[PDB]
């Protein structure tokens, strides 16, 4: 069976390093999943794409990135895509995100690290 990961030093090092932040171990292990896109032609599983997007948002939000109006743009799109593809606290946020007034930045800055904890035990 052919897999995108060479051995268990890429299917485990990325798994460990994606959630142990260090501000530089989820960046090494976020550029090691843009390589598994090439090894699958141009495709990644929906769960892996969602997980990578939700940390792409974080590494710009934690460092400082851009203004608040341009940081809930990443957060909102990431959360909406995650909910659509992969209760009411996090399921009703998408309606306020896409159909009604822009949710406060702290709403995203809580929902994102809520859902990131949901992929730590279910997939990774």
């Amino acid at each position: 069976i052919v897999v995108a990961w060479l051995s268990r030093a890429e299917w485990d090092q990325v798994t460990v390093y994606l959630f142990c932040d260090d501000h530089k171990l989820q960046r090494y292990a976020l550029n090691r999943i843009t390589v598994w896109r090439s090894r699958s032609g141009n495709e990644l599983p929906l769960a892996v794409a969602s997980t990578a997007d939700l940390i792409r948002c974080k590494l710009l939000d934690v460092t400082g990135g851009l203004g608040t109006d341009e940081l809930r743009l990443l957060y909102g799109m990431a959360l909406v895509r995650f909910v659509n593809l992969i209760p009411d606290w996090i399921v009703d946020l998408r309606h306020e995100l896409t159909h009604k007034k822009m949710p406060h930045i702290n709403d995203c800055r809580r929902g994102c690290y809520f859902v990131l904890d949901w992929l730590q035990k279910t997939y990774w």
Binding site: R32, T34, V35, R37, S38, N42
Partner: peptide
């Protein structure tokens, strides 16, 4: 690497 976006540092694993 045509038809992809591979990070420049981690490019030798796409050619192995």
């Amino acid at each position: 690497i045509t038809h992809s976006d591979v990070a420049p540092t981690h490019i030798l694993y796409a050619v192995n």
